């Protein structure tokens, strides 16, 4: 239907299509695809895994029984021992740090399992397993509809404004539809995003820059937001790609020096961006949610397919417009439908759980994104 094609293409330009993964359907449900996995360093091979187990867990009680040439592992990373009794000269009691130090001081060495051809063919060895696992899920396409095209006396006004009115009205109605779609997406993102948390939530409580705390400049929020990016990087093979925040949470708060208000837009920003941060990823703004939050997260693609996102969007067309001229009221209806979902497997151990849930069920997907985090913010209101 060319008119749906034209209206849709000319209207979805108004929604945050890039803060979700974009996929499409032609079915009553959307077949969504995506990737998740358990960890992030070195190999995912079983033989290598066993080797890790066959060398040592590196308990502090054993860290000093190691000598030159030995291997050890910790948190699934294999490290090699340089000279004897590594850590003998490191006073640090917390192995996580003692190891950090040992690597810096060259007492140990990050171990590479790159190997000769001989290693593999000679032992007729195993081969590495997947670092990633790929999922598919099916989420129903839901509709949302408008009866917003009021015409009657308004039709006469539209005739008076007949210069523009035919399409003007549809474009306007379509604009309101875009708004609702965008808002719908944002609610889902808010819900799915994992709560960014550090030491009991962002330094032992949601960040608070209120008058009862730190009505500073907004610098401390920018710092927390930048850390949200760190979190994405530490947890996944991606850097944050986008950020959305309320006007008070960042569009204005970061105006203090950590936000550029779109000095350029024919390069690297979406047309619906507010601007971008000083450690910028395009900054978008919801303007509705009472939370005054910040979301940091990532969409990504393999060739044309946006296989990565916390939320996925898949519209189904055959922006449909209709008229119902009862009495003197030839009003215009607008119908749009799409599937919206999170990867349901982030709340499932296997298919026997995934098959009884729905990525579009935001009661179950709440806080389980892993491709995005949300920061609650107490502002100086």
């Amino acid at each position: 239907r060319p008119n749906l094609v034209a209206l849709t293409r000319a209207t979805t330009k108004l929604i945050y299509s890039d803060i979700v993964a974009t996929q499409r359907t032609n079915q009553p449900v959307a077949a969504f695809y995506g990737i998740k996995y358990l960890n992030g360093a070195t190999y995912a091979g079983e033989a290598g895994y066993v080797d890790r187990e066959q060398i040592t867990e590196l308990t502090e009680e054993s860290k000093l029984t190691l000598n030159k040439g030995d291997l050890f592992k910790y948190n699934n990373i294999v490290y090699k021992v340089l000279e004897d009794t590594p850590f003998a000269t490191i006073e640090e009691s917390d192995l996580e740090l003692a190891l950090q130090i040992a690597i810096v001081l060259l007492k140990v060495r990050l171990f590479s399992d790159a190997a000769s051809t001989s290693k593999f063919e000679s032992s007729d060895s195993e081969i590495a397993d997947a670092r990633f696992q790929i999922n598919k899920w099916q989420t129903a396409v839901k509709s949302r509809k408008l009866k917003t095209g009021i015409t009657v006396e308004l039709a006469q006004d539209l005739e008076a404004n007949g210069f523009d009115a035919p399409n003007f009205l549809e474009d306007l109605l379509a604009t309101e539809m875009a708004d609702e779609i965008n808002k719908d997406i944002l609610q889902s993102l808010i819900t799915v995003s994992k709560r960014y948390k550090v030491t009991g939530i962002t330094d032992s409580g949601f960040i608070d820059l209120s008058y009862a705390s730190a009505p500073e400049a907004g610098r401390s929020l920018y710092r927390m937001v930048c850390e949200m990016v760190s979190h994405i990087q530490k947890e996944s093979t991606y850097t944050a790609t986008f950020c959305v925040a309320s006007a008070r949470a960042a569009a204005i708060l970061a105006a203090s020096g950590w936000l550029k208000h779109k000095p350029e837009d024919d390069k690297y920003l979406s047309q619906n961006a507010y601007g971008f941060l000083a450690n910028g990823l395009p900054l978008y703004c919801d303007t509705n949610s009472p939370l005054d939050y910040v979301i940091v997260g990532v969409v990504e693609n393999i060739g044309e397919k946006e296989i990565v996102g916390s939320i996925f969007y898949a519209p189904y067309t055959e922006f449909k417009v209709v008229v119902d001229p009862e009495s003197l009221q030839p009003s215009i209806g607008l119908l749009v439908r799409y599937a919206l979902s999170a990867n349901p497997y982030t709340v499932a151990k296997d298919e026997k759980e995934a098959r009884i849930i729905d990525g579009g069920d935001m009661d179950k997907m709440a806080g389980r994104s892993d491709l995005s985090v949300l920061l609650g913010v107490k502002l100086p209101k």
Partner: peptide
């Protein structure tokens, strides 16, 4: 093989239609 609707799918999920009475 032939006593059912077929309505072959071109994708899992995927669906069939039926002329269910209003009841």
């Amino acid at each position: 093989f032939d006593i059912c609707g077929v309505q072959p799918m071109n994708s899992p999920t995927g669906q069939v239609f039926a002329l269910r009475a209003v009841y």
